[PDB]
């Protein structure tokens, strides 16, 4: 588990195996089964993002992985809060492909963008450019950069190419609450 | 020791084993026993932070680990001066849990925040937001973000979740003197 | 391939072997032969840099490596879009030595600088200093910093020494489209 | 050599072993003996820092290591131009201890500060704070932060403690030409 987590994160880790083991011992005192349900997971985001409405967001993050074990729980927290976005592109594809069918549709992008938008304070909201100030505008822009028609599908190959190649695209799909905020101020 | 330090720091290290070995040879010329007392440790902070009152701070850092050996001494200096705060969350919990009982109480947070505040120059002080300009205000805000009642306790699980998840929380518990300063100017 | 890529990038990687393997499976669904032609490669840049004219640029990048296999394709995308420029100096020499003869001539630098310039929007263009606002001015400045006469040749030794030693030089040869942009605003 | 360099730099490297090997092949075409003299080394700095007077600086850097072999040459270029200063503290001590006797005297600090100052353009010079605008002022401030009397000696232990602990000190001893410049603008 600790080496397994460290193995999956590799460059994104903010912990050593010993520290992961300490966190783990603590986690087990709280969740003796070593599993956390979707409801328990959503509560972490509700408790730590008082100003926003993190429910949809936390559910989508949970979904990207019944329950999550400690490994997935630790990775989820790293994906939403630590590291650079360009190091999480594979995972991000999993977040955007809402139904897990392997391709991202326009409706899926809208779904994720809407949930991310709910993480932003209505205050930070008016600091947004006119062309990206609503879920639908932000989602359309994204679809547009990928050169997609409403009917089209986006594969993992194109998704990684575009997000890596063009930083403008990376900035639009960005899902970490803090980074979405710190790109305006 | 050098591999042992390098092993504990892992990603936070600013030295190679050879350089650690050089520093060590130098350290032994000064402290032949290879041990440094609390009083000797406090003197390093007093000597290098002339403008502040580092005593309480240095004592708490020392405590987080009679004497410290070279390994702990090197780690302590890394914890207070190098790397990114999000990579020191496990250690930070040890710093905040003043009595080492495993949970952080409101009084402990106040204790650490007060010591950190003593590291800031009275000059940089008035550059602080109204809601975080005194030890008690800064400590209350922290307790408030964790959703705690004065009577409550904070576990290591919640501490890591909150500090990692919400950067606002990370900024409030930040203990490195330089970062506390460079977040205002 | 995944370990082979990870081996060549080493510090520049934004992916783990597992993620590279996922991207690969996706790539094969699109290109069953596991090879991508110059024309297919150019299309990625045309599709993701709508505002510029990426043809010459994409051709030079392709050339630095008939077809490219997945490994070279992944590295090419990393070279143009991720990491710090100072970590790509060896590769950059390969990009500038247009004919692959081992030395860079003044005409080669002009060729690459012109292609890079085509990646910049005519809008960002007037934000350029007077002495670097045209391909020929930018190329001359570069040649001048290297202390070269129009007739001279630049070896890989001098190229690495100059670009590493003097950041001014590094900034002038910079080839990543985003960095060229973000150095003005 | 390539693994040996990679071993000494470890975290500071901007090259892979293969790239170091390429640079090496190029270096040998220029210096078949694989050795570079002090005069040859100084010429690199003179050629790439046209606006300054890099002689004293290049000599001190050379000295910190007759001739230098490729390994030392590569490390020297990394020390002066790449990475973060806090990762080069052991080496920096070697740079400041001009006579190699193991302790730094006030005259040695003045010597190095003067050489570094010669790397700054007279233009960037007036952008310097009043208390650090001359070699003697900058050197005195440094000695003062270390709490030293003119007669005193500075050991490697204290040097590392102070430079790591107090970023103000790190900024004053900073020796990379670019960083000295980019700390004003
Ligand atoms: Ca889907
Ligand atoms: Ca306690
Ligand atoms: Ca050529
Ligand atoms: Ca000396």
Chain C residues in contact with D13 (beta carbon < 8 A): 11
Burial of A160 (0-12, 13-18, 19+ CB in 10 A): buried
Asked if the C-beta of A45 comes within 8 angstroms of chain B's C-beta atoms, the answer is yes
Three-state DSSP class for residue A67: strand
Contacts of D164 (CB under 8 A, 6+ apart): B14, B77, B78, B81, B82, D86, D89, D170
Contacts of B69 (CB under 8 A, 6+ apart): B1, B34, B35, B36
Cα C149 to its chain centre, rounded Å, is 25
Chain B residues in contact with A19 (beta carbon < 8 A): 89-90
Contact assessment for residue C23 and residue A160, using Cβ atoms and an 8 Å cutoff: yes
Q: How distant, in Å, are the alpha carbons of B159, B160, B171, C184, D105 from that of B163? A: 6, 5, 8, 35, 44
CA–CA separation, C31 and C25 (whole Å): 10
Q: Do A23 and B90 touch (CB under 8 A)?
A: yes
Contact assessment for residue D30 and residue C157, using Cβ atoms and an 8 Å cutoff: yes
For residue D79 the two structure tokens come to 């020390």
Asked if the C-beta of B178 comes within 8 angstroms of chain D's C-beta atoms, the answer is yes
Cα A27 to its chain centre, rounded Å, is 22
Comparing C-alpha atoms, which of D88, D84, D57 is closest to residue D75? Answer: D88
Three-state DSSP class for residue D183: coil
- Approach to solving: X-ray
Asked if the C-beta of B145 comes within 8 angstroms of chain A's C-beta atoms, the answer is yes
Phi, psi (rounded to 5 degrees) for C155: -90, 165
Question: CA Rg, chain B, in Å?
Answer: 17
β-sheet bridge partners, residue A105: A153
Contact assessment for residue B146 and residue B158, using Cβ atoms and an 8 Å cutoff: yes
Phi, psi (rounded to 5 degrees) for D129: -60, 150
Cα A144 to its chain centre, rounded Å, is 21
Q: How many CB atoms are closer than 10 A to CB C84?
A: 13
Q: How many CB atoms are closer than 10 A to CB B126?
A: 8
Contacts of A131 (CB under 8 A, 6+ apart): A137, A141
| Vertex D167: Cα angle to D165 and D173 (nearest 5) | 105
Contact assessment for residue D132 and residue D140, using Cβ atoms and an 8 Å cutoff: no
Contacts of D63 (CB under 8 A, 6+ apart): D98
Question: If residue B68 lies in a helix (H) or strand (E), which one and from where to where?
Answer: strand B67-69
Contact assessment for residue A75 and residue A5, using Cβ atoms and an 8 Å cutoff: yes
Resolution at which this structure was determined, Å: 1.9
Q: Do A8 and C15 touch (CB under 8 A)?
A: no
From D54's Cα to the closest Cα of chain B, the distance in A is: 27
CA–CA separation, C2 and C21 (whole Å): 6
Q: At what angle do helices D17-30 and D2-9 cross, to 10 degrees?
A: 120
Contact assessment for residue C91 and residue C12, using Cβ atoms and an 8 Å cutoff: no
Q: At what angle do helices C55-64 and C106-117 cross, to 10 degrees?
A: 130
From B144's Cα to the closest Cα of chain D, the distance in A is: 31
Which letter does DSSP use for residue C134 in this model?
S
CA–CA separation, A14 and C26 (whole Å): 30
Q: How many CB atoms are closer than 10 A to CB D112?
A: 25
Phi, psi (rounded to 5 degrees) for B105: -105, 165
For residue C154 the two structure tokens come to 């630049």
Q: How many CB atoms are closer than 10 A to CB C114?
A: 17
CA–CA separation, B61 and B112 (whole Å): 10
Phi, psi (rounded to 5 degrees) for C154: -115, 125
Contact assessment for residue A5 and residue A18, using Cβ atoms and an 8 Å cutoff: no
Residues with C-beta atoms within 5 A of ion ligand 4: D 97, 99, 101
β-sheet bridge partners, residue D35: D69
For residue B25 the two structure tokens come to 């040879």
Give all strands (DSSP E) within chain D, no chain letters: 35-37, 67-69, 104-105, 153-154
- Residue-wise DSSP of C58-116: HHHHHHH--EEEHHHHHHHHHHHHSS-GGG-HHHHHHHH-TT-SSSEEHHHHHHHHHHH
Three-state DSSP class for residue A102: coil
Contacts of A46 (CB under 8 A, 6+ apart): A54, A55, A58
Asked if the C-beta of D28 comes within 8 angstroms of chain B's C-beta atoms, the answer is no
SS3 content of chain B, % helix, strand, coil (to 5): 65, 5, 30
CA–CA separation, C164 and C173 (whole Å): 11
- Residue-wise DSSP of D73-113: HHHHHHHHHSS-GGG-HHHHHHHH-TT-SSSEEHHHHHHHH
Q: Do B48 and D11 touch (CB under 8 A)?
A: no
CA–CA separation, A43 and A34 (whole Å): 17
Which letter does DSSP use for residue C33 in this model?
T
Contact assessment for residue A103 and residue A93, using Cβ atoms and an 8 Å cutoff: no
CA–CA separation, D101 and D59 (whole Å): 18
> All domains of chain D, ordered by start, with CATH?
1-84 (1.10.238.10), 85-185 (1.10.238.10)
For residue B125 the two structure tokens come to 């002080």
Dihedral, CA of residue A49, residue A54, residue A59 and residue A65, to nearest 10: -40
C86 annotated ligand-binding residue? no
Cα C101 to its chain centre, rounded Å, is 18
Contacts of A57-62 spanning 24+ positions with Cβ under 8 A: A57/A115, A57/A116, A57/A118, A57/A119, A57/A177, A59/A115, A60/A95, A60/A98, A60/A111, A60/A112, A60/A115, A61/A95, A62/A38
| Vertex A168: Cα angle to A164 and A174 (nearest 5) | 75
Dihedral, CA of residue A7, residue A10, residue A13 and residue A18, to nearest 10: 40
Q: Find the residue in C nearest to A154 (Cα).
A: C26
Three-state DSSP class for residue D69: strand
CA C71 to ligand 2 centroid distance, Å: 52
Q: How distant, in Å, are the alpha carbons of C9, C143, D28, D38, D122 from that of D23? A: 17, 20, 9, 20, 34
CA–CA separation, B83 and B98 (whole Å): 23
Question: If residue D169 lies in a helix (H) or strand (E), which one and from where to where?
Answer: helix D167-173
CA–CA separation, D16 and D11 (whole Å): 12
Asked if the C-beta of A4 comes within 8 angstroms of chain B's C-beta atoms, the answer is no
CA–CA separation, C181 and A146 (whole Å): 21
Question: If residue D139 lies in a helix (H) or strand (E), which one and from where to where?
Answer: helix D135-145
CA–CA separation, C73 and C9 (whole Å): 12
β-sheet bridge partners, residue C67: C37
Contact assessment for residue A44 and residue B161, using Cβ atoms and an 8 Å cutoff: yes
Burial of D65 (0-12, 13-18, 19+ CB in 10 A): middle
CA–CA separation, C15 and B185 (whole Å): 36
The owner of tokens 């450019």 is A129
CA–CA separation, D153 and D99 (whole Å): 13
Phi, psi (rounded to 5 degrees) for A150: -50, -30
Contacts of A42-50 spanning 24+ positions with Cβ under 8 A: A44/B161, A44/B165, A45/B165, A47/B147, A47/B162, A48/B145, A48/B161, A48/B162, A48/B165, A48/B166, A48/B169, A49/A119, A49/A177, A49/B165, A49/B166, A50/B145
């Amino acid at each position: 588990l600790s080496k397994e987590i460290l193995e999956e994160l590799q460059l994104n880790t903010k912990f050593t195996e010993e520290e992961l083991s300490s966190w783990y011992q603590s986690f087990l005192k709280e969740c003796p089964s070593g599993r956390i349900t979707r409801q328990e997971f959503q509560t972490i985001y509700s408790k730590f993002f008082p100003e926003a409405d993190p429910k949809a967001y936390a559910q989508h993050v949970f979904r990207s992985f019944g329950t999550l074990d400690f490994k997935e729980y630790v990775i989820a927290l790293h994906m939403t809060s630590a590291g650079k976005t360009n190091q999480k592109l594979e995972w991000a594809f999993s977040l955007y492909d809402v139904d897990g069918n392997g391709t991202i549709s326009k409706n899926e992008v809208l779904e994720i963008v809407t949930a991310i938008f709910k993480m932003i304070s209505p205050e930070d909201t008016k600091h947004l450019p006119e062309d990206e100030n609503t879920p639908e505008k932000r989602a359309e822009k994204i679809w547009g950069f990928f050169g997609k028609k409403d009917d089209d599908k986006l594969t993992e190959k194109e998704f990684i190419e575009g997000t890596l190649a063009n930083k403008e695209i990376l900035r639009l799909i960005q899902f970490e609450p803090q980074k979405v905020k710190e790109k305006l101020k």
